[PDB]
């Protein structure tokens, strides 16, 4: 437990071994205190010295201690990461990726992940310095299982950070260069590798349809659906996020998710005890019901409408909001038969019960659904017996009370329904 000035005195000595002991003392400060003195280290001017120690191939111990110390500085604020980058650390770490000492190469991987994890600017600067080639070469082995578990996990996590962030998204050529390795990692049988691999995919699919196509063309959808059914929550969460991103694209992209068997998993996802899973599963459903009518029919066939009625009936409000969207898209693009079936499953009552929430956006969504439901009844000549349903469950008391609502389109559609069916 040295003081910062003692560390300074050692690193400023003209003795490599005294520099080594001081650098190690710094590393222990930065890795053992709950609130490490990163800023005091930076202010003392030690970052340039640490960076210079990265290049002392004749003393692998001081390479490791400096790499560890800089890794933990880089794991702090954007300003602390910037101090590491400003000391010229990026090229020095990339040159350590070729080290014959596995624990040193791993530490350089770790440090680069923290730098890239700061944002799109440093992510792209790591790429411009040529980090991808040597990173991917560390995984150019016939069987990933022969690599150390902690080593492989750190490589996967750092790669996911190179896929991370938008405004802008990673360079297209960088994504194409990484994807083959990501796909291979997506099949490795370690829970942590799988989780971070799914996260990387979820980042790459969070964008316009051309980005989604890059991923879907690699044929990873069936594997994502498989991980969607995993028992480890840390895997299901990113797998579901990736699947949800894919279904925001075209109807053809959404169809690959359906063809892979995704809908069969949603009974459990839509009743999953983790609130976030249920919410994201219902968001995914809302983008499937906005597709073609034959895709709406697969939702019906898989028995998922009762589950939408269930979430609409009882769930976290954010989840109910997503379900309301799911029903509006359903009724806008669905056939008359499909809309009739939706009523026969009990959609109306829970739909009405949600017309008394403190959220203007959901009321609008609900009222558009009712209109598109009434529209389907007009085409069948029984707007009456639907009006009674909405009456018997207390739906007319709400819609009446919404005509006197302080908002643009609430009383608009409210008046319209009242005076056209009631």
């Amino acid at each position: 437990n040295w003081s910062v000035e003692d560390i300074v005195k050692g690193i400023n000595s003209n003795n490599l071994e005294s520099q080594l002991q001081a650098t190690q003392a710094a590393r222990k400060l930065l890795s053992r205190e709950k609130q490490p003195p990163i800023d005091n280290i930076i202010r003392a001017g030690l970052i340039p010295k640490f960076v210079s120690f990265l290049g002392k191939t004749d003393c692998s111990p001081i390479q490791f201690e400096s790499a560890w110390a800089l890794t933990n500085i880089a794991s702090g604020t954007s300003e602390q990461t910037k101090a590491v980058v400003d000391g010229g650390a990026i090229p020095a770490f990339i040159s350590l990726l070729a080290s014959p000492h596995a624990h040193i190469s791993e530490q350089a991987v770790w440090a680069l992940g923290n730098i890239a994890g700061d944002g799109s600017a440093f992510r792209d600067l790591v790429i411009k310095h040529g980090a991808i080639d040597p990173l991917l070469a560390l995984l150019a082995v016939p069987d990933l299982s022969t690599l150390a578990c902690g080593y492989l996990r750190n490589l996967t996590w750092t790669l996911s950070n190179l896929c991370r962030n938008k405004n802008p998204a990673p360079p297209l050529d960088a994504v194409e260069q990484i994807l083959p390795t990501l796909v291979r990692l997506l099949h490795h049988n370690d829970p942590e590798v799988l989780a971070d691999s799914c996260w990387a995919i979820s980042y790459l699919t969070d964008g316009p349809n051309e980005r989604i196509e890059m991923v879907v063309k690699k044929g990873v959808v069936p594997q994502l659906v498989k991980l969607l059914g995993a028992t480890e929550l840390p895997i299901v969460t990113p797998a579901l996020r990736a699947i949800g991103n894919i279904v925001t694209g075209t109807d053809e992209q959404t169809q690959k998710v359906i063809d892979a068997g995704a809908l069969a998993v949603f009974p459990s996802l839509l009743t999953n005890p983790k609130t976030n899973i249920q919410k994201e599963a219902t968001w995914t459903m809302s983008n499937i019901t906005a597709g073609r009518q034959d895709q709406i029919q697969q939702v019906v066939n898989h028995g998922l409408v009762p589950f939408l009625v269930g979430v609409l009936s009882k769930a976290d409000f954010k989840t109910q909001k997503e379900a309301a969207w799911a029903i509006t898209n359903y009724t806008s693009g669905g056939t008359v038969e499909q809309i009739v079936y939706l009523v026969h499953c009990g959609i109306i009552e829970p739909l009405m019960n949600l017309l008394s929430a403190k959220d203007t956006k959901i009321i609008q969504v609900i009222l558009d659904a009712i209109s598109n439901i009434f529209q389907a009844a007009e085409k069948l000549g029984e707007t009456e017996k639907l009006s009674i349903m909405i009456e018997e469950c207390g739906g007319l008391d709400k819609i009446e009370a919404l005509q006197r609502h302080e908002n643009e389109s609430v009383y608009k559609a409210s008046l319209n329904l009242i005076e056209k069916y009631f």
Partner: peptide
């Protein structure tokens, strides 16, 4: 996004 080695 960032990890310290502790």
């Amino acid at each position: 996004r960032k990890r310290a080695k502790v």
